[PDB]
Amino acid sequence: TRYLRIHPQSWVHQIALRMEV
């Protein structure tokens, strides 16, 4: 995995919108 790198806060609101919530 690489979840120890990605900055989580701002990133979530670009996936969620494209992926039909």
CA distance 21 to 14: 10
CA distance 14 to 1: 20
CA distance 10 to 21: 16
CA distance 3 to 8: 9
Dihedral pair phi/psi, residue 17, rounded to 5°? -80, -35
CA distance 21 to 4: 24
One-letter amino acid of 5: R
One-letter amino acid of 8: P
| Stretch (H or E) spanning 3 | none
DSSP one-letter code for 7: -
Alpha helices in the chain (DSSP H): 8-18
Q: Which residue is associated with the tokens 């900055």?
A: 7
